[PDB]
Design a binder for this molecule. Structure first.
Ligand SMILES: CN(Cc1ccc(Cl)c(Cl)c1)c1ccc(S(N)(=O)=O)cn1
Ligand SMILES: CN(Cc1ccc(Cl)c(Cl)c1)c1ccc(S(N)(=O)=O)cn1
Lengths: 304, 304
């Protein structure tokens, strides 16, 4: 028992992290097979980042201008291409540590692990969620660009995020591994305000189920509600609307705890309306929304 | 910027995790060089765990009774010995993935990463603290015993914890890699109540410094205090007494933010007395105590 914000074991991804330098910009790349994926802004200088013309900047760059270092061994770059906001550097050596992998684009409210890296070297691993406004709340210093987000299903790493920037507001934006930004963000040093950071209702409900399953029961009440009634309260509190699809996804946890999803919604409704009154749930004084229903089942069932 | 509860990258430790089976008990072992370390309770059956005589139980066990599996390959056990509460299984093969490593016994308030494992296979990684009552608040299901806690300094893994049990109260107890329990706990299914789970003051202060450094400034006040005055309030709130050693340890963060340690203590004092008033610090509604001053500097400086 006990419930922790758990990341995937990072080893399979550690074995893919390299350093990419172009001129005076160093950041991280992802080495899978004979391709290194990195943010295209690696080609950008100081004055370039205000309104960079990536096509024009890239013309001035040859394969030999991209310095790719794996540990303390240099990889030979035999090709480069820009796909959306990422560069693909073809190297002459397949990464011998390439895991089974996929590139997935995740939906807002889905969670993933980040392996924060500097100079192609891992600093730490943490779990976060794609926010409903398509930001993530990360831990990224200068040099962390090209750090990746991922999920693992047994031995298959699904890469879903590559870090590109911290926005003016101290929140983070990046791309899938096809180089498409999540949300409306662009790889340019400009005004980029995020939308409302709404709470991922279905995740809160999952986490309340985790709380029940690990003994924190105090917030269970005598009430029920309907989706429509609950959603009136969700709206008021900047919670994502709950859909029948979310109810279906919570079916497993509903079954286990024998608590109907709508009864848990009524518990969440009272918590929203009444607050915690100085009490805690799974060591938190706020309602946690970076566990998916799948995460709660995975952690409660001990999948490896 | 941004501040996350970050674990060490787990790869170096993933490469050390094996499965140990004795009779009908399966749990995890740590394979370093030609030794596998695992909880001694691996030899215990259903009725054994109420008051096991480990010396007597171990007499009935031979090397061939300890089944050690690394991935899906069996290791040959050429010796076994009990050291305190761990078994050391000598195998005929050095772990080719053995990292540089040390065994350290940590002090309460020190943090470490856990790699939660089942059947010698990694499920997830998370950061926790040795509590002042020598428990940890983990995420451990049946089969997770022998999962380890560790810190990394560059390429050296310092192993500090091996999981042995969840106590009646839903909190966790284990040993250093010499097999000595943290705190008064024993590897026996008996009444084992934990002491007061006090808050790690020096860690809270570190985390308030992290908050300032990443822009959450609202709790900074016009006041100062003394260690003695602060400690009167700490006592009242089940916070660990703050010592001059803790002040010295916070010197780096004091310097950076230009906020004196005693001024930050006065901020913490008001937060204790007044509460958060529904506000948050680094996305938390309670004062976080599982970051050490060293952790805050490491994360804020991007050590790999
Ligand atoms: C935190 N960070 C790096 C940084 C900033 C200031 C200093 Cl003093 C240092 Cl050492 C490093 C950035 C960099 C660009 C942007 S942006 N896209 O809004 O211009 C935001 N954040
Ligand atoms: C949570 N856990 C395993 C468990 C418990 C009950 C069930 Cl239903 C299942 Cl599936 C698994 C244990 C096991 C022993 C103890 S102790 N040392 O206090 O007796 C505490 N917790």
């Amino acid at each position: 028992s006990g419930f922790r914000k758990m990341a995937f074991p990072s080893g399979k991804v550690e074995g893919c992290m390299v350093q990419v330098t172009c001129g005076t910009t160093t950041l991280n790349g992802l080495w899978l097979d004979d391709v290194v994926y990195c943010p295209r802004h690696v080609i950008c200088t100081s004055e370039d980042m205000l309104n960079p013309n990536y096509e024009d900047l890239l013309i001035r760059k040859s394969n030999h201008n991209f310095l790719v270092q794996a540990g303390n061994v240099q990889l030979r770059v035999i090709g480069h291409s820009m796909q959306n906001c990422v560069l693909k550097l073809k190297v002459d050596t397949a990464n011998p540590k390439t895991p089974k992998y996929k590139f997935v684009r995740i939906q807002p409210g889905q969670t993933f692990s980040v392996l924060a890296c500097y100079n192609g070297s891992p600093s730490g691993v943490y779990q976060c969620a794609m926010r409903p406004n398509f930001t993530i709340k990360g831990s990224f210093l200068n040099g962390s660009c090209g750090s990746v987000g991922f999920n693992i299903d047994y031995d298959c790493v699904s890469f879903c995020y590559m870090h590109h920037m911290e926005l003016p507001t101290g929140v983070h934006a990046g791309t899938d591994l096809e180089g498409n930004f999540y949300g409306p963000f662009v790889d340019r040093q400009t005004a980029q305000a995020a939308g409302t950071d709404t709470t991922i209702t279905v995740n809160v409900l999952a986490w309340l189920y985790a709380a029940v399953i690990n003994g924190d029961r105090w917030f269970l009440n005598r009430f029920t509600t309907t989706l429509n009634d609950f959603n009136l309260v969700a709206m008021k509190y900047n919670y994502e609307p709950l859909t029948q699809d979310h109810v279906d996804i919570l079916g497993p946890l509903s079954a286990q705890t024998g608590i109907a999803v709508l009864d848990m919604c009524a518990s969440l409704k009272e918590l929203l309306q009444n607050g915690m009154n100085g009490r805690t749930i799974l060591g938190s004084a706020l309602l946690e929304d970076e566990f998916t229903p799948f995460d709660v089942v995975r952690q409660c069932s001990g999948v490896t």
